[PDB]
């Protein structure tokens, strides 16, 4: 169910790492955050609100939005705030 997209996650506001991710766009922008914490050594944790900024598009989305509904596609870089 959905459609696979290749994106980049940027933890600039945390340990500063950057990884690439491929997942179904029917997922909530929030999913990128769960995955981010599982995959990386982020001794933080994440900030409430779960807000993301699509760097290449200079637009912020609520972590509750559906990725597809945010026009987020391959190439997009999501900066977790």
UniProtKB/Swiss-Prot annotation:
Query: Domain of life, per the record?
Result: Bacteria
Explain the consequences of disrupting this gene.
Answer: Cells lacking this gene are blocked in YukE secretion. They display an increased bacteriophage SPP1 resistance phenotype.
Task: Explain the purpose of this protein.
Answer: Required for YukE secretion. Probable component or regulator of the ESX/ESAT-6-like secretion system (BsEss).
Family per record: Belongs to the EsaB family.
Name of the featured protein: ESX secretion system protein YukD
Q: Could you tell me which species this protein originates from?
A: Bacillus subtilis (strain 168)
List the top taxonomic levels of the source.
Answer: Bacteria, Bacillati, Bacillota, Bacilli, Bacillales
Q: What's the encoding gene here?
A: yukD
């Amino acid at each position: 169910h959905g459609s696979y997209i290749d994106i980049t996650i940027d933890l600039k506001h945390y340990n500063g790492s950057v990884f690439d991710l491929r997942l179904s766009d029917y997922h909530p922008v929030k999913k990128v955050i769960d995955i981010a914490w599982q995959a990386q050594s982020v001794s933080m944790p994440p900030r409430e609100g779960h807000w993301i900024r699509v760097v290449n598009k200079d637009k912020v989305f609520s972590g509750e939005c559906k990725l597809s509904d945010c026009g987020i596609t391959n190439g997009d870089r999501l900066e977790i705030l």
